[PDB]
Design a protein around this ligand. Structure first.
Ligand SMILES: CCCn1ccnc1C(=O)O
Ligand SMILES: [Zn+2]
Ligand SMILES: [Zn+2]
Ligand SMILES: [Zn+2]
Length: 231
């Protein structure tokens, strides 16, 4: 079963194998008095690993690298951060010093620099317009438009029908909005519609925080985002 927030102490990282050569990574963090789970992705590409998002902080990201070596034993050669918040780029300097090439859109890199968050080294071109998609090795990167943040990307693994929606997508047990300080509430449902229309075939859908599901997570998130818009 998928590890939930209560089952993971802060500092430890779990890996959940989804398909041949595709995992999620799950960590936990204390924030504003509560403990939150956090998801990322791992995708094999030949004999190297592509990492999607840090494990939320230097300590968790060191643990993530150690659990990868233990359970997979293939090197992480590139990483992509899906937006500029600390749960996605916090740990980038740990990755960089381990030899990982860190990537993010110019939008994400600009926003991280402004916030004082760690900044991925390389830039992802071709993603500035809503609906833009680019191939990145074993995944497609998709910019659906502004949602949880103006820069959020989603990641699709075509070999496995896995769609990592990041923080643009809510888990079912979340029935109220999360951190929406950087969000575009007016555009969020339209951006979700772009995800549905671009990956209607997705089978396994992973939120940025919590339990995966199917494409019904998109409808769930639209429901929650609209109830927050109206209250
Ligand atoms: C579980 C939502 C609260 N949260 C904590 C850290 N990041 C978030 C988010 O909404 O993206
Ligand atoms: Zn965020
Ligand atoms: Zn988050
Ligand atoms: Zn729902």
């Amino acid at each position: 079963e998928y590890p939930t927030v209560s089952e993971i102490p802060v500092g430890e990282v779990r890996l959940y194998q989804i398909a041949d050569g595709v995992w999620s990574h799950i960590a936990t963090q204390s924030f504003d008095g509560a403990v939150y789970p956090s998801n990322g992705l791992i995708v094999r590409d030949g004999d190297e690993l592509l990492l999607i998002d840090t494990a939320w902080g230097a300590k968790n990201t060191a643990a993530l690298l150690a659990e990868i070596e233990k359970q997979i034993g293939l090197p992480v050669t590139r990483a992509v951060s899906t937006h500029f918040h600390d749960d996605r780029v916090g740990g980038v300097d740990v990755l960089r010093a381990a030899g990982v090439a860190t990537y993010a859109s110019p939008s994400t890199r600009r926003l991280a620099e402004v916030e004082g968050n760690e900044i991925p080294t390389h830039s992802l071109e071709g993603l500035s317009s809503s609906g833009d998609a680019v191939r990145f090795g074993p995944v497609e990167l998709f910019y659906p438009g502004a949602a949880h943040s103006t820069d959020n990307l989603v990641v699709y693994v075509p070999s496995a029908s896995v769609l990592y929606g990041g923080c643009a997508i809510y888990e079912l047990s979340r029935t109220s909005a999360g951190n929406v300080a950087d969000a575009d509430l007016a555009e969020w449902p339209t951006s979700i519609e772009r995800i549905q229309q671009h990956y209607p075939e997705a089978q396994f859908v992973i939120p940025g925080h919590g339990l995966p599901g199917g494409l019904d997570l998109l409808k769930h998130t639209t429901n929650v985002v609209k109830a927050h818009t109206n209250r």
